[PDB]
């Protein structure tokens, strides 16, 4: 019987359901490759396409759902559109997940 | 630059896939605040000790949780601090969005 076992309670089923869906969104090798690039630098669709070795149309399409899913965001500067990870939570959960499997 | 190797991306994808389980997340949400014995978790979750023990076996094999011996009790805890951090960050991100 842990010291504070009586003081704890699990996350609500609705919250756990929403969190599970979030992780389901990340269980995609293609999405993770794109996020691995944005974790190190903000990049334009042109740079991402060259790195992953796919067309700009393909990256642009994948980035759309990523944007809708609130995993990435973008900023416009002059004639360029730079994509970035949504927030620091995204890079942290990404880096921690990777470090975890590296540490096993 | 270069993206992560394809097998690394695949392993990471499978890792997030195992986390896409509401029941596992409820268990992890408890361990995120304290290591706990099977009895404490079973009562918190409202399920039998046998059930939680079974759920924990899977989590152990998946390297999400570990256990240790402290006196006359076995306590389960999250495998490492990375699990702690990714859980909290994912949760906070969802709470603000
Ligand atoms: Zn966030």
From Swiss-Prot, chain B:
DNA-binding region: 38-57
A GO molecular-function annotation: metal ion binding
Bridged cysteine pairs (disulfide): none
HTH arsR-type domain mapped to chain residues: 4-97
Keywords annotated in UniProt: DNA-binding, Metal-binding, Repressor, Transcription, Transcription regulation, Zinc
Consequence recorded when altering residue 82 to Q: Loss of metal-induced derepression
Assembly behavior: Homodimer.
Other remarks in the entry: The zinc ions are bound between subunits, so that residues from both subunits contribute to metal binding.
Role this protein plays: Transcriptional repressor of the expression of the smtA gene. Binds two zinc ions per dimer. The complex of DNA and SmtB is dissociated by zinc ions.
Protein name per its UniProtKB record: Transcriptional repressor SmtB
UniProt source species: Synechococcus elongatus (strain ATCC 33912 / PCC 7942 / FACHB-805) (Anacystis nidulans R2)
Gene, per the UniProt record: smtB
Full protein stretch here: 25 to 121 of 122
């Amino acid at each position: 019987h842990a010291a504070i076992a009586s003081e704890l309670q699990a996350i609500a089923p609705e919250v756990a359901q929403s969190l599970a869906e979030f992780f389901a969104v990340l269980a995609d090798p293609n999405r993770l490759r794109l996020l691995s690039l944005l974790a190190r630098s903000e990049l334009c669709v042109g740079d991402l396409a060259q790195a992953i070795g796919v067309s700009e149309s393909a990256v642009s399409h994948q980035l759309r759902s990523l944007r809708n899913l609130r995993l990435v965001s973008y900023r416009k500067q002059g004639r360029h559109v730079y994509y970035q990870l949504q927030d620091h939570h995204i890079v942290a959960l990404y880096q921690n997940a990777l470090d975890h499997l590296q540490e096993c």
